[PDB]
RNA sequence: AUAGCGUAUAUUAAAGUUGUUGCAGUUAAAAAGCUCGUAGUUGAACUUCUGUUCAGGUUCAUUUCGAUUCGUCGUGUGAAACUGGACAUACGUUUGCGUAAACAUUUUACUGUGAAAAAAUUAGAGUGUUCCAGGCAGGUUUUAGCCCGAAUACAUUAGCAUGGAAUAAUGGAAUAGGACUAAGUCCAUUUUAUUGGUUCUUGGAUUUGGUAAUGAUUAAUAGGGACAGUUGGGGGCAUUAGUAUUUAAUAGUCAGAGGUGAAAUUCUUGGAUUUAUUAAGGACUAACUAAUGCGAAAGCAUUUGCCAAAGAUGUUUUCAUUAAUCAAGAACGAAAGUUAGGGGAUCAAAGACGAUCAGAUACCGUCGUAGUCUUAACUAUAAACUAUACCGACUCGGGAUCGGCUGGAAUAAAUGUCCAGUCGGCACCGUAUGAGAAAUCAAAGUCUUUGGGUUCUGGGGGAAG
């Protein structure tokens, strides 16, 4: 039985069948139709943007805190994006309307941990790093 | 007019699934009036200079034979 | 103790005709003597429809389901 | 049609042998005398039956035939058969009188 | 619908070896089935076997001892160039140390080994170990 | 097994040919006499099969080919009495027509409509065979109206 | 980890979570409601089996030996699978010197060689770029030189050449001048330095004698067909019954009937409920009625008659691979619903009311329309359920059951009993040293010891049918 042809003239039906069923695999689907290119980064690794808002975001259950964040206007897209601002009092290194460098959170299009729905993090402020600034290597 | 079409059936091999696939090709051939050609006969044709848009082949030898049903469905790999 | 190659007769006789080694049939042929005109005829064991003796036209056998009914005083022997 | 069964016992059993012709195999398992399967370390139900040899005076000789049977065979209830036949081929059954 | 008589006879065989059975009635049979058996017998696995002529296809009784761990057919009967031998002996067989992959060749039906010694190949039939 | 009954169709009706190919010892008819009887029966408009039955029940002839060497139809062919349309197809069409007949009148009968579909299906399916094997004229088709006038 | 090391994103292994090898689909996502069927994929068995002898190697074994040596060689003897001769009704003629050709061998797939083939890459030999990445160089005082290298493999598909026995497909002589051979008749015809007649050859066609074993494999526990006694709640027409609900008539009798947890809406003196006898009108087939039957599924239960159809069994009947599964394309397909007519008794969505309740636009009660039934038509859907695809094998035991058949036995001698076989159905009960995550499963078994044939479906959850 096995519901699958075994025969030596069966070649195309086999391969076509796969060329079909392959679509149910998600990464294949998302890859094959442009999905990457339409996302707020336009397929890219990071993006530069402007800061519209500094915003607090109350954490998912069962955690309570205020996640410091920013809403950024991506310069390539002009799409609006909600991004997280890492470590401690780094929300202070940000002024409204700065240039800011933004990357994924490591789930490739999805939110991490207790921050609901927020898919991006802040990397650079003006030109400098949040790391450089935090450890106080450079000054803004 | 003085032209037929010929059909060559072959098995193309798909490496992965490790079996073959049934493909065919249609070659327009030129028939000299000196031949009696029944639909569904066996033709030998030599290469030729470009006679027309489609035709690069000319009929050399006809072999008579009987095909049952339509000529299309009949599959001979020789 | 059992050997497929030398199966036991009384067993094969019990088996269905297709499940024996030689796949042998159950039918016979019989010489039948008409009760009236005393003619001898040949009749298949499971014979279909009806048989009338050629001499006197009287009824010898009746059809069924694999049995033939030998009618009345008609005597028979199996041919083999 | 016995031939293969006889030829099977014709030569002795050997564990792994390297090119230096050592025996490498830690122990040589007993194999069942009917099915010819291997007798496990772990086999709960594998059995070795010893049966006595008899002189014309009814005397035991102290001589024994050992018939090994394996778990699957007893368990399927083939044992009572297997044994009898194993005793035929060794010439010990039926018992003469 | 019967396809591949070699497959019928081979599976029925393995089944009866596995059930500890002492012999197998095998039906129906072909050249190929008999050459395959002549091969397994020659190679030590089955014992003596007898062919029975019913006027049609045939029947075959096979004395088994027990040796066969498995004996299969591969369908479809693939194409096995000499290059591909490695694949098939690694994929099909229990170990390098034994077991055979039988093939049809224009030189006849062979242990894959007989094929290296005959230097040919190309059509896979089955295997036994 | 039984064609076009999926699920349970599967069983074995009998016939099993004996081993002895030689005709039986008690049988005294010359193969010629047999060919005579079979042709008489034939000209009377019987079927190769029906002829077979007659020879077997009445005449003590178990298998005609093991006597003659020629099967019944081949005999009919040589000796010229021939059943133009194969007995085989003949009956299938007779049937498909009896169903046509009954169905024109009872138009609400669904089972018989479906049975018809099945039988016609088999008819075409046999046509292909007898055509590729040259036993039927190449342009021959089964239609309602064509086959109704077709010797059935 | 380390002169590097975090992070983001695409992609690779992890992934047997894309599965040809190699996955899953009873309940985790998953078998299409059901049949027919074209493309596609898939296809039962049979043909120079075999034996005898010779040689060449190649392997093997070793109570044959040897020689030398740190293991090869020689040799035994037998034993193998070859390879190739040879004779056997037996892998071909015929000619020119082990090799060509021509003739003849139906074609191919497949396989072994070979040709044709781009370097750099990659694999890899040689070589101490101080190692190494790597480079293609190098090594030597015998120097107005010398020594040595710049390998080789791989180079998939398709073309090309050639060896092939199996396997697989296809072929050939069934209206046969088919084959061989002899004798004729035509149409061509190179050579005979040239044209003309005769001829010759040759190569096509054709007529007739003769020769030959003249030419048709079995007959699948494959399939189609015939036929014979049956079996069925399969279908379509007609017929026909039966109480029951509702209503009416004709008789009776009276004060209450209904309904509920209580009740109230209702019905009732114009006489209800109730009783007897009829009649009308639509439905519906109780009980027998079952782990029973039939039908493709949906579904099918009163009598009789008609019409076509069906399985299983029985065949020493006939055909002879006609078959399996199936995108296209088709026939069906509960209920509810829709269109146009009928019909309208029962129930009864909507609705009207009673009650209950905090609220009931609900469960309960009294009513009641569409519907329920029917002609013609649409519609295509269900937990359309064994949630379990179809054809085919093979793997345990036991009674029983429905339908055939085969013997046997008892009687009150038969369309009835019982007994023993067996073929096919629906199941059940044990049991598996078989399967599974388990529940469980005689298939859901014969699965990492992974390949009998074929369609379909699934790839975290929602979004969302
Ligand atoms: Mg994935
Ligand atoms: Mg990461
Ligand atoms: Mg959480
Ligand atoms: Mg630090
Ligand atoms: Mg069957
Ligand atoms: Mg569920
Ligand atoms: Mg075959
Ligand atoms: Mg010869
Ligand atoms: Mg009435
Ligand atoms: Mg009525
Ligand atoms: Mg019943
Ligand atoms: Mg209406
Ligand atoms: Mg109240
Ligand atoms: Mg009511
Ligand atoms: Mg009886
Ligand atoms: Mg599983
Ligand atoms: Mg277990
Ligand atoms: Mg059970
Ligand atoms: Mg599998
Ligand atoms: Zn008489």
CSV table of C-alpha atoms (C1' of nucleotides) in Angstrom, one decimal, chain G residues 88-295:
chain,number,residue,atom,x,y,z
G,88,A,C1',25.5,-33.6,-27.6
G,89,U,C1',18.3,-32.3,-32.7
G,90,A,C1',22.1,-27.3,-29.1
G,91,C,C1',24.6,-18.4,-29.7
G,92,G,C1',24.2,-18.6,-37.4
G,93,U,C1',25.7,-18.6,-43.1
G,94,U,C1',29.2,-17.4,-47.2
G,95,U,C1',33.6,-15.5,-48.6
G,96,G,C1',39.2,-13.2,-48.2
G,97,C,C1',44.0,-13.3,-44.2
G,98,G,C1',43.0,-14.6,-34.2
G,99,U,C1',40.7,-10.0,-37.4
G,100,A,C1',37.3,-7.7,-41.4
G,101,A,C1',33.4,-7.2,-44.1
G,102,A,C1',29.1,-8.5,-46.5
G,103,C,C1',24.6,-11.4,-45.7
G,104,A,C1',21.0,-13.0,-41.9
G,105,U,C1',19.6,-12.0,-36.7
G,106,U,C1',12.1,-7.6,-35.0
G,107,U,C1',13.1,-3.1,-32.6
G,108,U,C1',14.5,-0.3,-27.6
G,109,A,C1',14.9,0.5,-22.2
G,110,C,C1',18.8,-1.4,-19.3
G,111,U,C1',24.0,-2.6,-18.4
G,112,G,C1',30.0,-3.1,-19.6
G,113,U,C1',33.5,-0.8,-22.3
G,114,G,C1',35.4,2.9,-25.6
G,115,A,C1',35.5,7.7,-28.5
G,116,A,C1',34.4,13.0,-28.3
G,117,A,C1',35.5,16.3,-23.4
G,118,A,C1',38.3,23.7,-21.0
G,119,A,C1',41.0,25.7,-17.9
G,120,A,C1',40.7,27.4,-12.7
G,121,U,C1',38.2,24.5,-9.1
G,122,U,C1',37.4,19.5,-6.4
G,123,A,C1',39.7,14.5,-5.2
G,124,G,C1',44.9,13.3,-5.6
G,125,A,C1',50.9,11.9,-6.8
G,126,G,C1',55.4,14.3,-6.5
G,127,U,C1',57.7,18.4,-3.9
G,128,G,C1',59.9,21.0,3.5
G,129,U,C1',56.5,28.0,0.4
G,130,U,C1',61.2,28.1,7.8
G,131,C,C1',55.6,24.9,9.0
G,132,C,C1',51.2,26.1,6.8
G,133,A,C1',47.6,28.7,3.5
G,134,G,C1',49.9,27.4,-0.7
G,135,G,C1',53.2,27.6,-5.3
G,136,C,C1',54.6,24.5,-9.7
G,137,A,C1',58.5,24.3,-8.6
G,138,G,C1',62.8,22.1,-7.7
G,139,G,C1',67.6,19.0,-6.7
G,140,U,C1',73.0,18.8,-7.2
G,141,U,C1',79.6,22.2,-6.8
G,142,U,C1',80.6,16.1,-12.4
G,143,U,C1',79.3,24.1,-13.6
G,144,A,C1',80.4,27.5,-20.8
G,145,G,C1',76.8,21.6,-16.7
G,146,C,C1',73.9,17.7,-14.8
G,147,C,C1',69.2,15.3,-12.5
G,148,C,C1',64.1,15.4,-12.3
G,149,G,C1',58.5,17.6,-12.3
G,150,A,C1',54.2,20.3,-13.6
G,151,A,C1',50.8,13.5,-12.8
G,152,U,C1',46.3,10.7,-12.4
G,153,A,C1',41.0,10.3,-11.0
G,154,C,C1',36.5,12.8,-11.5
G,155,A,C1',34.3,14.9,-15.7
G,156,U,C1',26.6,13.4,-14.0
G,157,U,C1',22.0,14.2,-18.7
G,158,A,C1',21.7,14.0,-24.0
G,159,G,C1',24.3,12.9,-28.7
G,160,C,C1',28.5,8.9,-30.7
G,161,A,C1',31.0,4.0,-31.0
G,162,U,C1',30.8,-1.0,-29.6
G,163,G,C1',30.0,-6.2,-26.1
G,164,G,C1',25.6,-8.2,-23.9
G,165,A,C1',22.3,-14.1,-22.3
G,166,A,C1',18.7,-11.5,-17.4
G,167,U,C1',14.7,-8.3,-16.6
G,168,A,C1',10.8,-4.9,-19.1
G,169,A,C1',8.3,-3.3,-23.5
G,170,U,C1',7.4,-4.3,-28.7
G,171,G,C1',7.5,-7.7,-32.9
G,172,G,C1',6.7,-11.7,-36.2
G,173,A,C1',3.1,-17.1,-40.2
G,174,A,C1',-4.3,-16.8,-38.7
G,175,U,C1',-8.4,-13.0,-44.9
G,176,A,C1',-1.7,-16.5,-44.4
G,177,G,C1',2.2,-17.4,-51.3
G,178,G,C1',3.9,-17.3,-44.3
G,179,A,C1',9.1,-20.1,-45.1
G,180,C,C1',12.3,-23.1,-48.3
G,181,U,C1',12.8,-24.9,-53.3
G,182,A,C1',11.8,-25.8,-58.5
G,183,A,C1',9.4,-23.8,-62.9
G,184,G,C1',7.3,-19.7,-65.3
G,185,U,C1',5.4,-14.0,-66.2
G,186,C,C1',6.3,-8.8,-65.6
G,187,C,C1',9.3,-4.0,-64.0
G,188,A,C1',13.7,-2.3,-63.6
G,189,U,C1',19.0,-3.2,-64.3
G,190,U,C1',25.6,-2.3,-63.3
G,191,U,C1',29.0,-4.4,-66.7
G,192,U,C1',30.2,-6.2,-71.7
G,193,A,C1',34.2,1.4,-76.3
G,194,U,C1',28.8,2.7,-78.5
G,195,U,C1',23.1,2.8,-80.1
G,196,G,C1',19.4,-1.4,-81.5
G,197,G,C1',17.1,-6.5,-81.2
G,198,U,C1',18.0,-11.4,-78.4
G,199,U,C1',20.1,-12.4,-73.9
G,200,C,C1',22.6,-12.4,-69.3
G,201,U,C1',22.9,-11.3,-64.8
G,202,U,C1',21.3,-9.3,-60.8
G,203,G,C1',17.2,-6.6,-57.6
G,204,G,C1',11.6,-6.0,-56.9
G,205,A,C1',6.5,-7.9,-58.0
G,206,U,C1',3.4,-12.0,-59.5
G,207,U,C1',1.3,-17.2,-61.0
G,208,U,C1',1.8,-22.4,-59.9
G,209,G,C1',4.0,-27.5,-58.4
G,210,G,C1',7.1,-29.6,-54.6
G,211,U,C1',9.4,-29.8,-49.6
G,212,A,C1',8.8,-29.4,-44.3
G,213,A,C1',5.6,-32.1,-38.2
G,214,U,C1',3.6,-26.6,-42.2
G,215,G,C1',2.3,-22.2,-38.3
G,216,A,C1',-2.6,-20.9,-32.6
G,217,U,C1',2.0,-22.2,-24.9
G,218,U,C1',-1.0,-22.9,-20.4
G,219,A,C1',-5.3,-22.4,-19.4
G,220,A,C1',-3.8,-18.1,-13.5
G,221,U,C1',-7.8,-20.5,-5.8
G,222,A,C1',-6.8,-13.4,-12.8
G,223,G,C1',-10.9,-11.2,-15.3
G,224,G,C1',-15.4,-11.1,-19.0
G,225,G,C1',-19.3,-14.1,-20.7
G,226,A,C1',-22.9,-18.6,-21.0
G,227,C,C1',-25.9,-21.8,-18.3
G,228,A,C1',-28.7,-24.4,-13.5
G,229,G,C1',-31.3,-24.6,-8.9
G,230,U,C1',-31.8,-21.1,-5.5
G,231,U,C1',-31.5,-16.5,-2.0
G,232,G,C1',-32.6,-11.3,-0.5
G,233,G,C1',-36.9,-5.9,4.3
G,234,G,C1',-32.2,-4.1,-3.7
G,235,G,C1',-35.1,-1.0,-7.7
G,236,G,C1',-39.7,0.5,-10.9
G,237,C,C1',-44.6,0.2,-12.0
G,238,A,C1',-49.4,-1.5,-10.7
G,239,U,C1',-52.5,-3.8,-7.1
G,240,U,C1',-54.0,-4.6,-1.5
G,241,A,C1',-54.5,-4.7,3.5
G,242,G,C1',-54.1,-3.1,8.7
G,243,U,C1',-55.2,-0.9,13.2
G,244,A,C1',-53.9,4.0,14.7
G,245,U,C1',-54.2,9.6,14.8
G,246,U,C1',-57.8,13.5,13.0
G,247,U,C1',-62.7,14.4,11.4
G,248,A,C1',-67.9,13.4,10.2
G,249,A,C1',-72.4,10.6,10.5
G,250,U,C1',-75.9,7.8,13.3
G,251,A,C1',-77.2,6.1,17.9
G,252,G,C1',-76.3,6.5,23.8
G,253,U,C1',-75.5,8.9,28.4
G,254,C,C1',-74.8,12.5,31.2
G,255,A,C1',-70.9,17.2,34.0
G,256,G,C1',-67.1,17.7,33.5
G,257,A,C1',-62.9,16.8,29.9
G,258,G,C1',-57.9,18.3,28.9
G,259,G,C1',-53.3,19.2,30.5
G,260,U,C1',-49.2,19.9,35.0
G,261,G,C1',-45.0,19.4,40.0
G,262,A,C1',-48.8,22.3,40.7
G,263,A,C1',-51.6,24.9,37.4
G,264,A,C1',-53.5,28.2,33.7
G,265,U,C1',-54.4,29.2,28.4
G,266,U,C1',-58.0,25.8,26.0
G,267,C,C1',-62.7,22.4,24.9
G,268,U,C1',-67.4,21.9,27.0
G,269,U,C1',-75.7,21.8,28.1
G,270,G,C1',-75.1,24.3,20.8
G,271,G,C1',-73.7,18.4,25.0
G,272,A,C1',-67.7,17.8,25.3
G,273,U,C1',-64.3,14.0,26.9
G,274,U,C1',-66.8,8.8,27.2
G,275,U,C1',-69.5,4.3,24.5
G,276,A,C1',-71.2,1.4,20.0
G,277,U,C1',-71.5,1.2,14.4
G,278,U,C1',-70.2,3.1,10.0
G,279,A,C1',-67.8,6.7,6.6
G,280,A,C1',-64.1,10.5,4.8
G,281,G,C1',-59.1,11.9,4.4
G,282,G,C1',-53.9,12.1,4.4
G,283,A,C1',-49.7,9.6,6.6
G,284,C,C1',-47.4,5.2,8.7
G,285,U,C1',-46.1,-0.5,8.4
G,286,A,C1',-46.1,-2.0,15.2
G,287,A,C1',-45.6,-6.8,17.4
G,288,C,C1',-42.6,-10.9,15.1
G,289,U,C1',-37.4,-7.7,14.4
G,290,A,C1',-32.1,-10.3,15.8
G,291,A,C1',-24.1,-8.4,16.9
G,292,U,C1',-30.0,-11.4,10.8
G,293,G,C1',-30.7,-9.9,5.1
G,294,C,C1',-30.1,-6.7,0.5
G,295,G,C1',-28.2,-2.1,-1.9
